Amino acid sequence: TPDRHQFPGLANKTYFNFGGQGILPTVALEAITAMYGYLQENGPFSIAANQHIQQLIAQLRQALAETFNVDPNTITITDNVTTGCDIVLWGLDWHQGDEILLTDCEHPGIIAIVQAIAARFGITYRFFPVAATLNQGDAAAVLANHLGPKTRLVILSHLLWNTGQVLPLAEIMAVCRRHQGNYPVRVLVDGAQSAGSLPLDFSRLEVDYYAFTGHAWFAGPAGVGGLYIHGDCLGEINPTYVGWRSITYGAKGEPTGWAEGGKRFEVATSAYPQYAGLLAALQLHQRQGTAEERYQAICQRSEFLWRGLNQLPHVHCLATSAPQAGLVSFTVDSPLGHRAIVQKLEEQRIYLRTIADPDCIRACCHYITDEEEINHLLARLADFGP
């Protein structure tokens, strides 16, 4: 039984955009405001304040580590999902002619990094079709049919932001591992949608690099994210953007080496109070139940919505079977067009989003979502037709 009162934003609106940004819980707002008060009272720049901040950073790094069942050393703190991807990509020792493989469902921001890399190191990239594997086929097999001699890295979203498909990461990892080419194939995972909705254990699940953010499904504030790097891959990633938070210091205050673990990829001054906000949101989710129970709760709500949409004659879900996670994508048979339909809905305080490719509308159902909100969505969607 979810405590909806902890998320005051739920009232007087019908929110289905958790995948864009989660509704901020009261405890998170409180922790943010309290941090500003602490800095004002004790600093903001001083021995006591600087200590309190270092302690806060360590507490967030630890909560994130526990979240994925890994050691604090494998966790880097960033501001969003993308930065984590920039860290891995710019850190690899790319050689002219190396190749990168991406699914055809990756975020335009990520593709932009790859383009920048290709132009800088003369590497090449190409996509492999996974979108079409929502209701049939096998993305792992598709990848196998694309792996080549110079394939060095594969980039994929564990949960696709556009179609709602949960890719078979374990199988894809194996495929990459057994492959034999000029490089051991490594996989960078974009977890923008998976983290905070899917139960994730990186000690029971082999992963090389996993990027995520705290402002979507974890419901933290905009501006705080993180990155996971398996201990065996750390060496392969050279720090790129660095600062006073990336190194260790000498007797005269000079740089003497890299800071321990993932700290070497952290740059400098950040919005610390936001860190306290994410910490509070993380702890609030553990008090609501285990990751597994929250995931099933999410799936019960997504299936309820999915089922409701199947009944609507002019609505067509992309998934022919029950959603594997909280994302439900669909099209609407109407002359208006999806963009105008999302605006009409927002006019009635119903919040969903449009998806560019494929051209559809997407609803996100979280464990705090209830049947009344879903029925209200269904009621309004019912007014559109050909």
Ligand X SMILES: Cc1ncc(COP(=O)(O)O)c(CN[C@@H](CS)C(=O)O)c1O
Q: Which residues bind K ion (CB under 5 A)?
A: 310, 312, 315
Do the beta carbons of residue 78 and residue 227 sit within 8 Å?
yes
**Closer residue to a second copy (CB): 110 or 140:** 110
CB atoms within 10 A of CB 337: 12
| CA gap 288, 384 in Å, rounded | 37
Q: Which of residues 219-238 bind ligand X (CB under 6 A)?
A: 225
The item of a second copy, ligand X, K ion, none sharing an interface with residue 176, based on CB under 5 to 8 Å by kind, is none
Q: Judged by CB under 6 A, which of 19, 91, 262, 308 binds ligand X? A: 19
The item of ligand X, a second copy, K ion, none sharing an interface with residue 157, based on CB under 5 to 8 Å by kind, is ligand X
Stretch that binds ligand X, among 188-196, 256-264, 308-316, 329-337 (CB under 6 A): 188-196
- What interhelical angle do 108-121 and 81-91 show, nearest 10? 20
| CA gap 318, 224 in Å, rounded | 32
State the minimum distance, in angstroms, from the CB of residue 141 to a second copy.
26
**Closer residue to a second copy (CB): 26 or 310:** 26
Tally helices (H) and strands (E) across the chain.
10, 15
Give the CA radius of gyration of the chain. Answer: 22
Stretch that binds a second copy, among 114-122, 132-140, 144-152, 175-183 (CB under 8 A): 114-122
| CA gap 376, 222 in Å, rounded | 28
- Structural tokens at position 68: 């994925």
Q: Which of residues 150-179 bind ligand X (CB under 6 A)?
A: 157, 161
The item of a second copy, ligand X, K ion, none sharing an interface with residue 161, based on CB under 5 to 8 Å by kind, is ligand X
Stretch that binds ligand X, among 77-85, 115-123, 202-210, 273-281 (CB under 6 A): 77-85
For position 16 contacting ligand X by CB under 6 A, the verdict is no
Do the beta carbons of residue 173 and residue 202 sit within 8 Å?
no
Q: Judged by CB under 6 A, which of 96, 136, 145, 269 binds ligand X? A: 269
| CA gap 233, 74 in Å, rounded | 10
Q: Which of residues 3-22 bind a second copy (CB under 8 A)?
A: 8-9, 17, 19-22
The item of ligand X, a second copy, K ion, none sharing an interface with residue 315, based on CB under 5 to 8 Å by kind, is K ion
Question: Rounded to the nearest 10 degrees, how much is the dihedral formed by the CA atoms of 283, 284, 287, 289?
Answer: -100
Distances in Å between the Cα of 120 and the Cα atoms of 117, 160, 240, 265 are 5, 28, 14, 21
| CA gap 263, 133 in Å, rounded | 38
Q: Quote the DSSP letter at residue 259.
A: P
State the minimum distance, in angstroms, from the CB of residue 243 to ligand X.
6
**Closer residue to ligand X (CB): 36 or 249:** 249
- The residues binding ligand X (CB under 6 A) are 19-20, 80-82, 107, 109, 157, 161, 190, 192-193, 213, 225, 243, 268-269, 353
